[PDB]
Amino acid sequence: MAEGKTIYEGGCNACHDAGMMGAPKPGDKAAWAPRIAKGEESVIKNTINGLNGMPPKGGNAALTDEQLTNAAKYLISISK
Numbered sequence: 001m002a003e004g005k006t007i008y009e010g011g012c013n014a015c016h017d018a019g020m021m022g023a024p025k026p027g028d029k030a031a032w033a034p035r036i037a038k039g040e041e042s043v044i045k046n047t048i049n050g051l052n053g054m055p056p057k058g059g060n061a062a063l064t065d066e067q068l069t070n071a072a073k074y075l076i077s078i079s080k
């Protein structure tokens with residue numbers, strides 16, 4: 001499978017598929033739209049660095065910045 005989706009399915013989904021803490025669900029256009037509108041760069045920085053209940057790197061210590069980038073892009077791609 002594509003890398004961003006594979007990464008997503010291995011733990012990010014625990015919070016995101018359920019919307020825990022207000023995490024934006026995959027495919028939830030309305031949730032994602034204002035997050036996308038600030039630019040992909042901001043979205044990627046928040047994925048790497050963490051934002052509120054979103055842990056740095058999703059709490060997956062093995063991932064590269066490029067892998068985190070590809071998982072954030074996957075979520076953006078399916079939620080527009």
Ligand code: HEC
Nearest residue numbers: 012015021022023035042043046052053054057058071072
């Ligand atoms: C729960 C413990 C989480 C895990 C595990 C992951 N995410 Fe998450 N994410 C979470 C929350 C609560 C939020 C919203 C934060 C807020 O206060 O607004 C998010 C948000 C994201 C975003 C959007 C960031 C933005 O610029 O608005 C992305 C792209 C995102 N999360 C990606 C992501 C990925 C790729 C993860 C696994 C590697 C992952 N999250 C795990 C909560 C949780």
